[PDB]
């Protein structure tokens, strides 16, 4: 009799998300074995006939051959997310009908997955909505794809203004934050707290100009995006992920810039001690430490804000204690509130959370800001009274490699002089310490100060600016 174990080494089950995933993601590694084993080449792997005898010959391996797979599962932990959908699952409920739900926790200095939320309840409906559903990501984009790959071009610093003026997409829509057509110049602070969308447009528009490699960074996190040209592509057009792809995504930014890849297997042995699969680490420096860093108290702000998410009141409420751990997050609603995330990190640990309908029809308006924050609240407490030391109470720090520079809260960059139609401006204000990622730091001011804005744009701005010298 083959046997699928927690972390520990204690039974799952002999050869029910727990079981079909594990089983499912066992039987790929035993294929690959398999076929290894028995010399066929990748050539003759490309044959259906052969793939399908290979996939029925490894399920048939584990039914009847005593294998011992060892899963990245925590039994105590994976059981309380399981009672917290079940007790707790109904407060997602919004009067849209019933709302499915899928979370994965992660381990972010291993990739390993802890326990997951496969949906409300599998008996009555299977669908697995933490590993194999696939979904808009939304605004949650914006940290990984848009100001995360800035700051490391070392494009911006924590305090760099970008503009949220009124702007059109290539085919002449406007650029909208629900029914705003947008605003002034902003901080990255303000743009990420409220999740302003054309400051990430612009910061995506920065990146293609600069001819950025996007690709390169997003392919080593595991993410698969077939064209990098969209414009919307920082709030999610484009692009579709698991809750697992997704939590790797933000593991990587929680575990300073070094991706892990996700796993749900750590090892498959046959009963005398052979190695059938063994996972094997491979760390990549996705981020710079800096970059990562600055980006961790970026998204400190997020939530500490409460501008998308009642996150932290939800938890301060539950358990003060595990409230004042050094929470980071991010949430994403989709355009016609078809999917909510919200995406959480403690230094030790990320938890990543989806929200949305089968059949993709729109949930309320509130659905992610107050529900979905709720949930996950309740979540992240079980997780913490089942495992009282697994969230941690490390912070997350500045490395010291990163680049503080003193600049005008105005412009986001150096103080200095400027030339504004003729006249040169000696631009002076009040000051802020910003944060880089690279060697330098802030330039000085330049007229094009923000990223993105028209001519008309800057007119206004600098209009402003001068006015108050
Ligand atoms: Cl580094
Ligand atoms: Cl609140």
Same mark, same amino acid.
């Given at each position: 009799?083959?046997?699928?174990?927690?972390?520990?080494?204690?039974?799952?089950?002999?050869?029910?998300?727990?079981?079909?995933?594990?089983?499912?993601?066992?039987?790929?590694?035993?294929?690959?074995?398999?076929?290894?084993?028995?010399?066929?080449?990748?050539?003759?792997?490309?044959?259906?006939?052969?793939?399908?005898?290979?996939?029925?010959?490894?399920?048939?391996?584990?039914?009847?051959?005593?294998?011992?797979?060892?899963?990245?599962?925590?039994?105590?932990?994976?059981?309380?997310?399981?009672?917290? /959908?079940?007790?707790? +699952? $109904?407060?997602?409920?919004? *009067?849209?009908?019933?709302? %499915?739900? =899928?979370?994965?926790?992660?381990?972010?200095?291993?990739?390993?997955?802890?326990?997951?939320?496969?949906?409300?309840?599998?008996?009555?409906?299977?669908?697995?909505?933490?590993?194999?559903?696939?979904?808009?990501?939304?605004?949650?984009?914006?940290?990984?794809?848009?100001?995360?790959?800035?700051?490391?071009?070392?494009?911006?610093?924590?305090?760099?203004?970008?503009?949220?003026?009124?702007?059109?997409?290539?085919?002449?829509?406007?650029?909208?934050?629900?029914?705003?057509?947008?605003?002034?110049?902003?901080?990255?602070?303000?743009?990420?707290?409220?999740?302003?969308?054309?400051?990430?447009?612009?910061?995506?528009?920065?990146?293609?100009?600069?001819? /950025?490699?996007?690709? +390169? $960074?997003?392919?080593?996190? *595991?993410?698969?995006?077939? %064209?990098? =040209?969209?414009?919307?592509?920082?709030?999610?057009?484009?692009?579709?992920?698991?809750?697992?792809?997704?939590?790797?995504?933000?593991?990587?930014?929680?575990?300073?810039?070094?991706?892990?890849?996700?796993?749900?297997?750590?090892?498959?042995?046959?009963?005398?001690?052979?190695?059938?699969?063994?996972?094997?680490?491979?760390?990549?420096?996705?981020?710079?430490?800096?970059?990562?860093?600055?980006?961790?108290?970026?998204?400190?702000?997020?939530?500490?804000?409460?501008?998308?998410?009642?996150?932290?009141?939800?938890?301060?409420?539950?358990?003060?204690?595990?409230?004042?751990?050094?929470?980071?997050?991010?949430?994403?609603?989709?355009?016609?509130?078809?999917?909510?995330?919200?995406?959480?990190?403690?230094?030790?640990?990320?938890?990543?959370?989806?929200? =949305?309908?089968?059949?993709?029809?729109?949930?309320?308006?509130?659905?992610?800001?107050?529900?979905?924050?709720?949930?996950?609240?309740?979540?992240?407490?079980?997780?913490?009274?089942?495992?009282?030391?697994?969230?941690?109470?490390?912070?997350?720090?500045?490395?010291?490699?990163?680049?503080?520079?003193?600049?005008?809260?105005?412009?986001?960059?150096?103080?200095?002089?400027?030339?504004?139609?003729?006249?040169?401006?000696?631009?002076?204000?009040?000051?802020?310490?910003?944060?880089?990622?690279?060697?330098?730091?802030?330039?000085?001011?330049?007229?094009?100060?923000?990223?993105?804005?028209?001519?008309?744009?800057?007119?206004?701005?600098?209009?402003?600016?001068?006015?108050?010298?």
């Amino acid at each position: 009799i083959s046997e699928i174990t927690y972390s520990d080494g204690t039974v799952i089950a002999s050869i029910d998300y727990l079981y079909f995933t594990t089983l499912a993601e066992a039987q790929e590694r035993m294929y690959d074995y398999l076929a290894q084993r028995d010399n066929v080449s990748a050539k003759e792997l490309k044959n259906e006939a052969t793939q399908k005898f290979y996939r029925d010959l490894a399920a048939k391996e584990i039914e009847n051959g005593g294998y011992k797979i060892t899963t990245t599962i925590d039994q105590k932990i994976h059981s309380a997310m399981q009672s917290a /959908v079940a007790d707790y +699952g $109904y407060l997602l409920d919004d *009067g849209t009908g019933r709302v %499915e739900v =899928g979370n994965v926790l992660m381990d972010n200095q291993t990739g390993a997955i802890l326990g997951f939320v496969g949906g409300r309840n599998y008996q009555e409906n299977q669908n697995n909505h933490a590993f194999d559903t696939k979904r808009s990501p939304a605004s949650t984009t914006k940290p990984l794809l848009a100001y995360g790959i800035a700051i490391d071009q070392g494009l911006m610093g924590s305090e760099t203004i970008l503009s949220n003026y009124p702007t059109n997409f290539a085919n002449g829509n406007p650029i909208m934050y629900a029914n705003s057509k947008g605003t002034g110049m902003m901080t990255l602070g303000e743009a990420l707290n409220y999740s302003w969308n054309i400051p990430a447009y612009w910061t995506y528009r920065m990146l293609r100009e600069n001819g /950025v490699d996007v690709k +390169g $960074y997003m392919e080593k996190m *595991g993410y698969e995006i077939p %064209e990098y =040209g969209i414009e919307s592509l920082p709030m999610g057009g484009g692009i579709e992920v698991t809750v697992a792809q997704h939590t790797n995504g933000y593991q990587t930014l929680a575990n300073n810039g070094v991706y892990h890849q996700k796993h749900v297997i750590s090892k498959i042995e046959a009963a005398d001690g052979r190695v059938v699969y063994e996972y094997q680490d491979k760390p990549v420096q996705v981020y710079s430490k800096a970059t990562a860093t600055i980006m961790q108290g970026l998204l400190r702000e997020v939530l500490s804000s409460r501008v998308t998410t009642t996150f932290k009141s939800n938890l301060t409420s539950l358990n003060p204690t595990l409230a004042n751990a050094d929470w980071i997050g991010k949430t994403g609603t989709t355009n016609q509130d078809e999917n909510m995330w919200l995406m959480l990190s403690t230094p030790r640990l990320t938890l990543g959370g989806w929200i =949305g309908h089968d059949d993709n029809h729109s949930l309320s308006q509130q659905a992610g800001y107050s529900n979905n924050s709720n949930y996950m609240a309740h979540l992240v407490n079980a997780i913490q009274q089942a495992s009282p030391s697994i969230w941690g109470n490390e912070r997350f720090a500045l490395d010291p490699s990163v680049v503080k520079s003193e600049v005008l809260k105005s412009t986001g960059q150096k103080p200095g002089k400027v030339s504004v139609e003729g006249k040169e401006v000696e631009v002076t204000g009040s000051t802020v310490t910003s944060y880089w990622a690279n060697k330098s730091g802030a330039p000085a001011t330049s007229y094009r100060f923000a990223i993105g804005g028209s001519d008309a744009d800057y007119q206004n701005a600098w209009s402003s600016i001068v006015g108050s010298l």
